[PDB]
């Protein structure tokens, strides 16, 4: 009342209507019949890409069409069913031989190591989902042999194992999976465990403050809200079992939510965490032709 420039905007800064309402689209859109229209001033073909909006010239407004009760399905295009298929994520090599007196293997959980799934899950900038992990484990030749294995999950902070029979393997608190090599692959479900509200595959910034160099800026882009710990694997034994072992990990993304789409990468990958490429060999997205007006 005494001063009202402060109340006039406080009661005007509520949720501003940004109507972009969507509708439940079960099947693809049909079409409606259209005759010829010889009219001036109403031009659906003339657009303006400079407005940042895509053309809305539909079929009925341009050519004479019939009507079709389109019954085609669109369910296989939702991101849920797009990421619902498991793919390779990481492979560990456990050489428990006489010359390799380690006994355990360790894998930093990072799905950015194999391009097949990285290329998909990097077309979106912010993703939030639950994963379904499946561990197949074979020998180097691909054989199964009745040796019991232990997979331990080491979240960020816990002590990583230091030996085949170290105390860390007691897994009093860490989740762990004991399974034999001659059993179905071990499958578990992991939730959205990031401290943030969504995983981000691109983090345009630095983790910490301070002076940042210009020669080896090895810390740029590395977001900590992504690193989710470590995966340790061993064979349950006191003495070495002479065998070469190989554990492959597959992850399924369920209950997915994606945000801020992104162009799909064209140049090949060179690094795991960084989106590096080479300016010497720029692989153009379109294959080359002989001439422009000679469509093959």
């Amino acid at each position: 009342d005494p001063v009202e420039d402060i109340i006039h905007d406080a009661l005007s800064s509520t949720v501003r209507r940004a109507i972009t309402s969507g509708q439940d689209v079960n099947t693809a859109a049909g079409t409606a019949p259209s005759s010829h229209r010889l009219e001036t001033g109403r031009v659906p073909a003339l657009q303006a890409a400079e407005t940042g909006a895509t053309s809305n010239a539909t079929d009925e407004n341009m050519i004479e069409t019939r009507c079709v009760m389109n019954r085609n399905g669109v369910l296989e295009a939702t991101i849920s069913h797009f990421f619902s298929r498991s793919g390779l994520v990481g492979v560990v090599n456990l050489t428990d031989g006489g010359t390799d007196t380690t006994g355990y293997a360790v894998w930093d959980i990072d799905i950015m190591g194999f391009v097949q799934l990285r290329r998909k899950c990097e077309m979106f900038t912010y993703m939030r989902f639950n994963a379904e992990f499946t561990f197949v484990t074979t020998t180097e030749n691909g054989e199964a042999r009745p040796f019991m294995l232990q997979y331990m999950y080491v979240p960020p902070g816990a002590p990583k194992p230091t030996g085949r029979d170290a105390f860390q393997w007691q897994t009093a608190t860490n989740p762990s999976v004991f399974v034999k090599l001659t059993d179905p692959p071990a499958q578990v479900s992991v939730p959205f465990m990031s401290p943030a509200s969504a995983y981000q595959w691109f983090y345009d910034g630095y983790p910490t403050f301070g002076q940042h160099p210009e020669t080896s800026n090895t810390t740029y882009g590395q977001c900590p809200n992504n690193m989710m710990g470590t995966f340790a694997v061993r064979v349950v034994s006191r003495v070495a079992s002479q065998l070469k072992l190989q554990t492959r990990v597959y992850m399924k993304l369920k209950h997915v939510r994606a945000w801020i789409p992104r162009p799909i990468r064209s140049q090949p990958y060179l690094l795991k965490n960084f989106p590096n490429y080479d300016s010497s060999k720029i692989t153009y997205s379109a294959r080359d032709r002989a001439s422009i007006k000679q469509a093959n």
């Binding site: 407005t51 630095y206 989106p275 590096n276």
Partner: protein, 246 residues
């Protein structure tokens, strides 16, 4: 009736005679962090007139063989005005932006600029070294250029591996020297956290690429500058302590 337009924020205003539209990024206005999404318990600060205004960066001269420029936000506004001071004194920053890029030219010049925003515009090191200990990484001044803004080295890949063709999925707008002379984009706060730092993480980046190169006949004006102006909208700051530049 639709070519003319006037934006006004704080104590500043922008006119335009040939720009025809206002691209609202992702169909959402900049708003304050609602209580159901806030994590910080302290009370933030909301000047709304000291920082919410149109800051005009320097001008970049469009040459016949230019390659494009990029800016980072809110990196550019970290040393200018009360926005710069609030961002240097506060730890948690949140705000949307209103971009406006002007590049006027006579009705005889020709060319087209692509003005887009790239949420989380992570740059890339251009080099074929595959070991992570010797691989080249972009320097600090190349990734956070500042108010000056940096230039591209190969815009066909946006210095980020991704092709420029699909970059149109981003909130974008063309500057076609035959129809319009400036492009404007209202972008909200795009981040995976309610608030974030203003000196470490840059929410997004602005991209200006001369797709159709500048071309003109002899005698016309050769100095065709590009000017960008930015207005932080619905800004909040929190976590006050001593001033840290970076």
């Amino acid at each position: 009736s639709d070519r003319v337009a006037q934006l006004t924020v704080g104590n500043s205003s922008i006119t335009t005679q040939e720009a025809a539209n206002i691209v609202l990024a992702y169909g959402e206005w900049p708003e304050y962090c609602p209580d159901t999404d806030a994590t910080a318990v302290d009370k933030p600060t909301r000047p709304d007139v000291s920082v919410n205004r149109f800051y005009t960066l320097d001008s970049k001269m469009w040459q016949e063989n230019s390659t494009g420029w990029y800016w980072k936000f809110p990196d550019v506004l970290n040393k200018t005005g009360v926005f710069g001071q609030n961002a240097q004194f506060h730890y948690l920053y949140r705000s949307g932006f209103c971009l406006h890029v002007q590049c006027n030219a006579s009705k005889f010049h020709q060319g087209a600029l692509l003005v887009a925003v790239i949420p989380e515009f992570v740059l890339a090191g251009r080099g074929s070294n595959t070991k992570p200990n010797e691989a080249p990484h972009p320097g600090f001044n190349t990734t956070f250029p500042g108010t000056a803004g940096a230039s591209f080295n190969d815009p066909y890949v946006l210095d980020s591996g991704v092709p420029l063709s699909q970059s149109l999925i981003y909130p974008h707008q063309w500057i076609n020297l035959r129809t319009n002379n400036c492009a404007t984009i209202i972008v909200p706060y795009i981040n995976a956290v309610p608030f974030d730092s203003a000196i470490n993480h840059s929410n997004f980046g602005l991209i200006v690429v001369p797709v159709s190169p500048l071309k003109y006949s002899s005698g016309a004006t050769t100095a065709i500058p590009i000017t960008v102006t930015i207005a932080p909208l619905n800004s909040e700051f929190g976590g006050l302590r001593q001033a840290v530049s970076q």
